[PDB]
Amino acid sequence: SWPPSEVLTAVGLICALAGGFAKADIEMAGPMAAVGLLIVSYVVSGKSVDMYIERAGDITWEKDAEVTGNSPRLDVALDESGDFSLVEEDGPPMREIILKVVLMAICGMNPIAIPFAAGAWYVYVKTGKR
Q1: 59 Cβ contact partners less than 8 Å away, ≥ 6 residues apart
Q2: CA 33 – CA 23 distance, rounded (Å)
Q3: Does residue 123 sit within a domain?
Q4: What is the spatial distance between Cα 32 and Cα 45, in angstroms, rounded to a whole number?
C-alpha cells in the first residue's frame, strides 16, 4: 500500500533533514546549532511513515479510509465524489497543521537550518498528508 506518491513525501522530509545540517554537525557547530538539527529531526520524525503506520493503528477518524482496517496509505487525493481521501476533514484546519510543523521548531537555535527545514516542510505538506 505504498504508491509512488511515497516519493513526494520522502523527498519533502529528506530535504528538511538536509537543511537541518546547515551549519550543524560540521565539527565547528555550536551547541545551539546541534539543537537546531535535533529539532528538525524531531519534527521530521513525527511525519515519518513509521509514525503514520502507528497513527493508522490508532485511527479513529471516520472519514479516513484506514479506519476500515485498510493498510496505511500515503496517497492523499481528492475523489470525483468531492471526498478528500485520507484527509482528516473533521480534524484541525490544514493551515494550523502546516503552521504547527514549522512552529514546533525554534529558529533561535539555528537561524539557518530551521527556516531551511521550514521551507522543505512547506513543500512536504503540499502532498495533503497530515
Answers
A1: 66, 67
A2: 7
A3: yes
A4: 20
